[PDB]
Design a protein around this ligand. Sequence first.
Ligand SMILES: *[C@@H]1O[C@H](CO)[C@@H](O[C@@H]2O[C@H](CO)[C@@H](O[C@H]3O[C@H](CO[C@H]4O[C@H](CO)[C@@H](O)[C@H](O)[C@@H]4O)[C@@H](O)[C@H](O[C@@H]4O[C@H](CO)[C@@H](O)[C@H](O)[C@@H]4O)[C@@H]3O)[C@H](O)[C@H]2NC(C)=O)[C@H](O)[C@H]1NC(C)=O
Ligand SMILES: *[C@@H]1O[C@H](CO)[C@@H](O[C@@H]2O[C@H](CO)[C@@H](O[C@H]3O[C@H](CO[C@H]4O[C@H](CO)[C@@H](O)[C@H](O)[C@@H]4O)[C@@H](O)[C@H](O[C@@H]4O[C@H](CO)[C@@H](O)[C@H](O)[C@@H]4O)[C@@H]3O)[C@H](O)[C@H]2NC(C)=O)[C@H](O)[C@H]1NC(C)=O
Ligand SMILES: *[C@@H]1O[C@H](CO)[C@@H](O[C@@H]2O[C@H](CO)[C@@H](O[C@H]3O[C@H](CO[C@H]4O[C@H](CO)[C@@H](O)[C@H](O)[C@@H]4O)[C@@H](O)[C@H](O[C@@H]4O[C@H](CO)[C@@H](O)[C@H](O)[C@@H]4O)[C@@H]3O)[C@H](O)[C@H]2NC(C)=O)[C@H](O)[C@H]1NC(C)=O
Ligand SMILES: *[C@H]1O[C@H](CO)[C@@H](O[C@@H]2O[C@H](CO)[C@@H](O[C@@H]3O[C@H](CO)[C@@H](O)[C@H](O)[C@@H]3O)[C@H](O)[C@H]2NC(C)=O)[C@H](O)[C@H]1NC(C)=O
Ligand SMILES: *[C@H]1O[C@H](CO)[C@@H](O[C@@H]2O[C@H](CO)[C@@H](O[C@@H]3O[C@H](CO)[C@@H](O)[C@H](O)[C@@H]3O)[C@H](O)[C@H]2NC(C)=O)[C@H](O)[C@H]1NC(C)=O
Ligand SMILES: *[C@H]1O[C@H](CO)[C@@H](O[C@@H]2O[C@H](CO)[C@@H](O[C@@H]3O[C@H](CO)[C@@H](O)[C@H](O)[C@@H]3O)[C@H](O)[C@H]2NC(C)=O)[C@H](O)[C@H]1NC(C)=O
Ligand SMILES: *[C@@H]1O[C@H](CO)[C@@H](O[C@@H]2O[C@H](CO)[C@@H](O)[C@H](O)[C@H]2NC(C)=O)[C@H](O)[C@H]1NC(C)=O
Ligand SMILES: *[C@@H]1O[C@H](CO)[C@@H](O[C@@H]2O[C@H](CO)[C@@H](O)[C@H](O)[C@H]2NC(C)=O)[C@H](O)[C@H]1NC(C)=O
Ligand SMILES: *[C@@H]1O[C@H](CO)[C@@H](O[C@@H]2O[C@H](CO)[C@@H](O)[C@H](O)[C@H]2NC(C)=O)[C@H](O)[C@H]1NC(C)=O
Ligand SMILES: *[C@@H]1O[C@H](CO)[C@@H](O)[C@H](O)[C@H]1NC(C)=O
Ligand SMILES: *[C@@H]1O[C@H](CO)[C@@H](O)[C@H](O)[C@H]1NC(C)=O
Ligand SMILES: *[C@@H]1O[C@H](CO)[C@@H](O)[C@H](O)[C@H]1NC(C)=O
Ligand SMILES: *[C@@H]1O[C@H](CO)[C@@H](O)[C@H](O)[C@H]1NC(C)=O
Ligand SMILES: *[C@@H]1O[C@H](CO)[C@@H](O)[C@H](O)[C@H]1NC(C)=O
Ligand SMILES: *[C@@H]1O[C@H](CO)[C@@H](O)[C@H](O)[C@H]1NC(C)=O
Lengths: 321, 321, 321, 162, 162, 162
Amino acid sequence: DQICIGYHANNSTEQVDTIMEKNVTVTHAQDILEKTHNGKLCDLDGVKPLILRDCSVAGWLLGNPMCDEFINVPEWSYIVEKANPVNDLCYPGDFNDYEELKHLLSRINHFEKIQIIPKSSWSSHEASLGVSSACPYQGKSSFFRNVVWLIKKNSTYPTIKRSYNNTNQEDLLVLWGIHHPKDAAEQTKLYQNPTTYISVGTSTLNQRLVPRIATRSKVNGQSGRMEFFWTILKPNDAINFESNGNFIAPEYAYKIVKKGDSTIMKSELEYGNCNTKCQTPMGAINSSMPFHNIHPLTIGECPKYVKSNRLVLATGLRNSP
Amino acid sequence: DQICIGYHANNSTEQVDTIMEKNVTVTHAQDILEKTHNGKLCDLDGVKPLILRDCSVAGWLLGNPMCDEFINVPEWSYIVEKANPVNDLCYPGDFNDYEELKHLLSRINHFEKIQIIPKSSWSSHEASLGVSSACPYQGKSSFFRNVVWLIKKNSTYPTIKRSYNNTNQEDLLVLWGIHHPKDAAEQTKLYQNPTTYISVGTSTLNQRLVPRIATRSKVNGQSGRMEFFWTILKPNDAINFESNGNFIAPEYAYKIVKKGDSTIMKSELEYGNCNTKCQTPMGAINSSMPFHNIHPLTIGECPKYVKSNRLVLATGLRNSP
Amino acid sequence: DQICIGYHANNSTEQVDTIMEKNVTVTHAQDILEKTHNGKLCDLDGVKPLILRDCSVAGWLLGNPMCDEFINVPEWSYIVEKANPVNDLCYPGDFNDYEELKHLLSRINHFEKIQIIPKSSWSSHEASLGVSSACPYQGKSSFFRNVVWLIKKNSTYPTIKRSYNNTNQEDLLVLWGIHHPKDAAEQTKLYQNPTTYISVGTSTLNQRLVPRIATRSKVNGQSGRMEFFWTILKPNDAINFESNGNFIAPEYAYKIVKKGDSTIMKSELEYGNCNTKCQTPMGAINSSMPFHNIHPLTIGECPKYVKSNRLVLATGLRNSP
Amino acid sequence: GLFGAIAGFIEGGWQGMVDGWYGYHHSNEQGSGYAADKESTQKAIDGVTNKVNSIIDKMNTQFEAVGREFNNLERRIENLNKKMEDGFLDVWTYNAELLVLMENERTLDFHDSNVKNLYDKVRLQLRDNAKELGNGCFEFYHKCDNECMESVRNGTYDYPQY
Amino acid sequence: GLFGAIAGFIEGGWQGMVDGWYGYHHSNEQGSGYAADKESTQKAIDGVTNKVNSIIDKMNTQFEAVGREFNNLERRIENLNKKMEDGFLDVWTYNAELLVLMENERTLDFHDSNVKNLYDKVRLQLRDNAKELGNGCFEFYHKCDNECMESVRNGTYDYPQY
Amino acid sequence: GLFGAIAGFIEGGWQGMVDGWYGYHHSNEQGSGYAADKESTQKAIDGVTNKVNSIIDKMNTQFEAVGREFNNLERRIENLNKKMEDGFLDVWTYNAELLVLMENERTLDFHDSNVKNLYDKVRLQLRDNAKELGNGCFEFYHKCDNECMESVRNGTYDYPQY
Ligand SMILES: *[C@@H]1O[C@H](CO)[C@@H](O[C@@H]2O[C@H](CO)[C@@H](O[C@H]3O[C@H](CO[C@H]4O[C@H](CO)[C@@H](O)[C@H](O)[C@@H]4O)[C@@H](O)[C@H](O[C@@H]4O[C@H](CO)[C@@H](O)[C@H](O)[C@@H]4O)[C@@H]3O)[C@H](O)[C@H]2NC(C)=O)[C@H](O)[C@H]1NC(C)=O
Ligand SMILES: *[C@@H]1O[C@H](CO)[C@@H](O[C@@H]2O[C@H](CO)[C@@H](O[C@H]3O[C@H](CO[C@H]4O[C@H](CO)[C@@H](O)[C@H](O)[C@@H]4O)[C@@H](O)[C@H](O[C@@H]4O[C@H](CO)[C@@H](O)[C@H](O)[C@@H]4O)[C@@H]3O)[C@H](O)[C@H]2NC(C)=O)[C@H](O)[C@H]1NC(C)=O
Ligand SMILES: *[C@@H]1O[C@H](CO)[C@@H](O[C@@H]2O[C@H](CO)[C@@H](O[C@H]3O[C@H](CO[C@H]4O[C@H](CO)[C@@H](O)[C@H](O)[C@@H]4O)[C@@H](O)[C@H](O[C@@H]4O[C@H](CO)[C@@H](O)[C@H](O)[C@@H]4O)[C@@H]3O)[C@H](O)[C@H]2NC(C)=O)[C@H](O)[C@H]1NC(C)=O
Ligand SMILES: *[C@H]1O[C@H](CO)[C@@H](O[C@@H]2O[C@H](CO)[C@@H](O[C@@H]3O[C@H](CO)[C@@H](O)[C@H](O)[C@@H]3O)[C@H](O)[C@H]2NC(C)=O)[C@H](O)[C@H]1NC(C)=O
Ligand SMILES: *[C@H]1O[C@H](CO)[C@@H](O[C@@H]2O[C@H](CO)[C@@H](O[C@@H]3O[C@H](CO)[C@@H](O)[C@H](O)[C@@H]3O)[C@H](O)[C@H]2NC(C)=O)[C@H](O)[C@H]1NC(C)=O
Ligand SMILES: *[C@H]1O[C@H](CO)[C@@H](O[C@@H]2O[C@H](CO)[C@@H](O[C@@H]3O[C@H](CO)[C@@H](O)[C@H](O)[C@@H]3O)[C@H](O)[C@H]2NC(C)=O)[C@H](O)[C@H]1NC(C)=O
Ligand SMILES: *[C@@H]1O[C@H](CO)[C@@H](O[C@@H]2O[C@H](CO)[C@@H](O)[C@H](O)[C@H]2NC(C)=O)[C@H](O)[C@H]1NC(C)=O
Ligand SMILES: *[C@@H]1O[C@H](CO)[C@@H](O[C@@H]2O[C@H](CO)[C@@H](O)[C@H](O)[C@H]2NC(C)=O)[C@H](O)[C@H]1NC(C)=O
Ligand SMILES: *[C@@H]1O[C@H](CO)[C@@H](O[C@@H]2O[C@H](CO)[C@@H](O)[C@H](O)[C@H]2NC(C)=O)[C@H](O)[C@H]1NC(C)=O
Ligand SMILES: *[C@@H]1O[C@H](CO)[C@@H](O)[C@H](O)[C@H]1NC(C)=O
Ligand SMILES: *[C@@H]1O[C@H](CO)[C@@H](O)[C@H](O)[C@H]1NC(C)=O
Ligand SMILES: *[C@@H]1O[C@H](CO)[C@@H](O)[C@H](O)[C@H]1NC(C)=O
Ligand SMILES: *[C@@H]1O[C@H](CO)[C@@H](O)[C@H](O)[C@H]1NC(C)=O
Ligand SMILES: *[C@@H]1O[C@H](CO)[C@@H](O)[C@H](O)[C@H]1NC(C)=O
Ligand SMILES: *[C@@H]1O[C@H](CO)[C@@H](O)[C@H](O)[C@H]1NC(C)=O
């Protein structure tokens, strides 16, 4: 008669690694690394993302006429922009401090477009002929919908002296621009005055731009350029404008109604008609694992990203052959 | 008759954590995390800090007349500045490369204020009427004590051409400024010449400023602005000035007599009449522990900061119930 | 009669450290930290470095006449520059975005110098008298070999309007400059026109420089300054020039024929007539160890840098005294 | 294993013991069978469960990457930003992979230890009332029916009685 | 514990043994009492002391934060700077907390090991001149007075003499 | 050591045993000598070899510094860059030094464990056919010639035969 001491075994083929030995077969294990995703861009917790599609953040905000889909977009969870959006600045040029502004959007979930300077209020300058074949809409020449390319009226461009007061509770993003024409002829042709400027001021801002005239390589048929600027007009502060010509005046500006957690995500994927609590540029994640290896840039309540191909903890003991 | 083998026990209630078990009672333990501080700002090893109180680094250096307490401050260990000091730039404006200069102060323990261009030496321009109600002192209009707001004398502002040579052994911090008036009238009213400039040069510097005239929001009753600049004049090098108007000329500049370990610490606390070898923005630390969890930004011989609430090592063994 | 169980011992004096005990003598150990190097700068895998010696990257690229050794350098593995090269800008001044350009060179292994605007093609301006005693060559006054200091011809400096088209497959680094003279007399003396400019444009670039006239400290006998600029002209794009005077025009520019792994290494050492697979600023490394403590900035297939003085693993067991 | 029991002097595990990690097998005139040892098994479950949660919890605070864009003449700080984000991923990847390796080793040894201790527990009761066979089994000198067997699993094996 | 002695086959510690971590308790006709084992105790003190200092010393080289300020249009690099400073704090916080957990476990097991080894040391002397009781105690077949007891604590227990 | 064998109940190693890490020494009428135990030795070699490569391999992915230069008014980001590069070196230096310390301790204990297990393997065969001397040796009751000795090293020691 006898009594023996022993331990459990089973049909498990699960393997775990250790320092001294690899591929040890064990009775029980626990995977802790999520390797799968759904391959889609989804609502984050019910709140759909802003999917710019073929537009860029500049095209959207300046109101590139190819970007009317985003003429008035509701609150978003995150933003999705392609790597090289085709519809950026239809009239060639620059966007000053573009990246600092993009960074600002990562703290913004909702804009409200409002009209600060009406188009019909420009009684001494021509406001409805500021259009280019570089910015076509529906077969016709058009322009950035949120700014006004003001030109001379009956051969006079008198000094502009306008002011807007932010009476709203909410911070106000304001955008304007300067036109850099191709030659001395175009300068007088569009604006009369040979030497011009745009002076802009707020409580913090002390700007004064001058057009640089030069013949340049043609982009979208244009040798001239448009340099765009922006500021955040605080509540109860006022922005001053003054110009001889070349002024690209604001018509619409955006109220910052909601701040908080957001991100600009670079991805070629479109909308997935879908919901999730964790989103990545390649797809969304639905798991209770403490880790994943899908992609480092995520948004939402997510597992922690590691570069591993495999993380498996032993729970049971060494399984017998 | 028998002999037994056994181990120590006692009345200890000290607990330690392990991977497999938490709150294990042990006979002896050793806390290694300092959790307490004295709540005060103190001398660091005998050397009192510079406590700017209601002044900012700009207010102090430019010599804002509300900041006379710091007219001549001795050597310091560290500097303490509030989050939003009320006495910054009494006349509104900007301070160019302000943060790069602040960063320079983290390597500086002592300044010596010296007069490079005397106020009485301005024989062709008016030097004692450069004052504003924006910078009041003792009920009267005053101005930044270290710079001179030069205006026209008997309706002429002739070209200034001044030079200073750093004959001292020590690097010299020099400060100057440009006035940006509210309108064309003030420009001629103060300086006569409609178009003006300030040109500044050293061995490395090649500057040329021009005032931007514009009507702006009123801050401390001022629509004009003051943009301040600085440089480090090396030993045996010379700084050249040239101007038609709008020149805010240096009177005093600071010698850099001692470099070394320092820091600008952001804190609302005042002086504690106190001494320590380790200081943090919330209070000073006096312990032999290898770790603390008070605050990450410390100065002096300090324990290492961690985010833990608790670090306790077991020394003894598992204590019996 | 008996049988005993036991373990190996030997004459080893090798020691290893553990958490509870230091300097434990063991029968066998394995060092894993490379502590030695050959003290030389060597070819990386057959490909010799560019050793600028007494020239700097600016002196080399602008073609400082003291830097003719590097008039046409072949493909390199890495670049070596001294801490304070004596032959930098022979005529004093600045190099705009110098560090961003240096960073670009860390991605470049080979340049090909080509002539974009011939010196003989300047038929309306004087091109062979742009020389200074600040840039001597062989006892005579000379100048940066890759750019042309154009001055007035028979008392006229007419407007320059030149264009170059990058017809090559390869990106093209282009360099030019602006002269900042000492006074109003020199301006007219060299260029006639009192007010001048240089306007430069590409597809992305919209530049317009103006000389700042001012008397400055003399460096290499010069009170004037030269501010140098650059751009990368993409394939099939064109660069536009326009100027009244002060233009330092390009003659030669560099084709970027090979990109890839490179680095600018700061070292006072010269060429070692030598080969290696791992190079550091103090010397090269030839070992199979997983770690070293020579220097953090290495290039090539290298061990991983740690700050340790000693890393020794135990393989054998505790050796008996 | 470090403790010599699992895949050591006990050559293999038991497919037949389903309701525990460690236990006993008996053989006498009345029959034979497996019985799990509840106390040491539940000890093992509690330890491994706390470990996993300890692991999961320590890794919960860990670096997160953010979107940051830079223009064509901000290459240096773009590169800095890239090296910084990547640097932390390598650190946390190393941390995670190493912790798993180290703790897997400890988990396997812990099971080895629990078996060894269970074996010694029985050895210390039976003392010289049974032959230690050298393979995890004890052969009794007296007959040992199911009550006797149960008394060994109890801890109550009345040594002097036999 | 891994080694089975502490809170295992030895059910609890001794309030009465004050001058050491491990030791002996004897009972005979002349009386009873505790005696600390000096050698194994001092071994334990040296090990734990070296560990603590090893821990303290490794953590001595560690990240320190500096004051760095940025303006309203330097948000990207401000954020970078914040993510960088925070990133290292999380790394060192993890390092510190994990080291304490891991080494606490090792420290407790080390004490378990020292007790087990002390017990085996005595067992290997007494051999079959005493009943191994199963609870840390040995019951002698011969009478064992204080000299006899001392000789066991010595290491000199003259087995053949008894 | 944790397992009590090396520099414990076995007081020292053997200069005379050259062809293995662990083994046996015999003494009888025909002579004496050392014999390495192949199985446990090769086990030790495989474990330590895998460890070293595991260590080398985990450290293979690790931070690399790049050259980055900044001008006189870019001191803040220069400092940031310096603090960042240095920060990672301290992290990897700590990682490397700690791993070596921890694993050195485990390596020494692993050898202790293999010796202890080898000793128990023999003890469990000989059972009561030999005196356990307390120093790693077993004194036989019967005479044990080289075939008998070999049978112990085998695992085949026919206990009932003696
Ligand atoms: C854009 O527009 C807004 C207005 O649409 C501008 O702000 C306004 O600026 C004007 C002056 O230009 C101020 O006028 C009066 O301000 C206060 C109003 O009452 C105060 O107390 C009530 C009590 O509840 C409170 O609701 C108000 O918010 C405010 O605190 C008057 O007291 C003040 O008159 C004063 O009388 C005192 C004693 O008689 C004197 O000592 C003072 O010297 C002063 O004369 C004055 O008549 C508005 O208050 C102010 N509105 C707001 C909401 O701020 C804003 O400035 C403009 N933008 C720019 C850039 O200018
Ligand atoms: C601010 O002010 C200081 C002076 O207050 C300026 O520096 C000075 O510049 C002048 C020229 O403008 C130099 O004049 C003489 O320099 C040396 C002086 O003696 C030399 O050797 C002694 C020996 O111990 C040493 O103490 C000096 O430091 C220096 O090394 C004269 O030798 C020199 O004359 C030379 O004679 C040689 C042979 O006869 C010739 O080959 C040379 O060509 C030359 O003619 C000259 O007369 C001062 O030396 C110099 N002082 C200092 C301390 O640097 C400084 O430049 C100014 N700032 C700016 C921005 O200009
Ligand atoms: C620097 O120099 C280069 C040339 O040395 C400039 O690029 C050239 O720009 C000219 C116009 O200024 C273009 O002219 C013709 O372009 C194409 C050529 O053929 C196309 O298809 C062939 C097929 O294999 C392919 O090899 C070519 O690469 C190209 O794709 C002509 O088709 C075009 O004529 C068109 O006819 C169509 C139908 O008849 C019309 O719809 C079109 O509207 C158009 O009239 C035209 O004659 C060159 O193609 C172009 N070369 C290159 C290599 O790009 C370059 O622009 C300049 N720099 C700057 C900044 O300007
Ligand atoms: C663990 O197991 C042992 C051995 O089986 C237990 O001892 C046995 O316990 C049973 C059930 O309590 C006893 O049965 C009783 O028998 C008496 C008459 O003899 C009767 O009056 C009761 O109604 C009951 O049926 C049995 O006598 C007893 N046998 C022996 C040999 O001890 C023990 O109780 C268990 N102990 C623990 C701590 O779990
Ligand atoms: C450890 O303890 C043992 C047992 O107590 C020690 O043996 C004893 O040692 C004492 C003190 O040295 C001896 O006393 C001597 O007695 C003789 C006469 O018999 C006398 O001539 C001496 O002056 C002295 O008083 C005692 O004889 C002896 N007893 C026995 C049974 O061995 C031993 O010395 C200790 N060994 C070590 C290594 O610590
Ligand atoms: C391990 O060692 C034992 C003990 O030495 C081995 O047993 C011995 O094995 C030898 C060689 O195989 C046997 O020799 C044979 O003798 C017979 C006649 O008796 C002869 O017919 C054969 O040609 C051969 O020479 C020997 O009898 C035997 N002795 C004993 C006491 O067992 C055993 O084989 C080894 N086992 C293992 C698993 O390694
Ligand atoms: C341990 O097992 C893994 C996974 O089964 C082995 O890796 C695979 O090896 C096969 C056979 O050579 C390859 O075809 C696969 O590509 C590997 N798969 C993966 C996911 O790595 C691994 O080689 C084994 N390691 C050791 C040390 O034996
Ligand atoms: C281990 O002990 C700690 C500290 O005693 C426990 O944490 C406390 O739990 C009490 C009772 O729920 C709370 O009221 C306190 O807020 C806690 N204090 C702290 C400092 O955390 C902890 O819950 C115990 N952990 C386990 C696993 O049992
Ligand atoms: C362990 O050994 C090391 C190296 O042998 C000791 O460090 C040396 O100590 C000597 C004697 O004091 C000094 O002169 C050397 O400068 C040291 N060399 C090095 C490389 O550190 C060390 O002191 C010993 N550590 C302990 C804890 O005993
Ligand atoms: C393993 O055994 C289990 C019994 O728990 C059974 O359900 C399962 O089908 C088996 N799996 C395989 C792959 O044989
Ligand atoms: C996530 O996965 C579970 C299954 O694991 C599924 O039942 C659940 O519906 C999923 N949740 C969402 C939000 O898709
Ligand atoms: C614990 O016992 C010690 C004896 O060393 C005594 O000094 C102390 O008062 C006791 N503490 C408590 C809380 O009972
Ligand atoms: C720090 O604390 C100790 C007590 O731990 C105290 O005696 C000493 O005075 C303190 N040191 C200083 C500088 O305050
Ligand atoms: C140690 O012994 C080895 C034998 O393997 C021998 O070759 C060597 O000379 C000895 N070394 C020393 C330092 O005695
Ligand atoms: C590196 O060192 C080995 C000796 O370890 C030597 O034989 C070999 O030639 C060296 N390789 C080179 C490229 O110098």
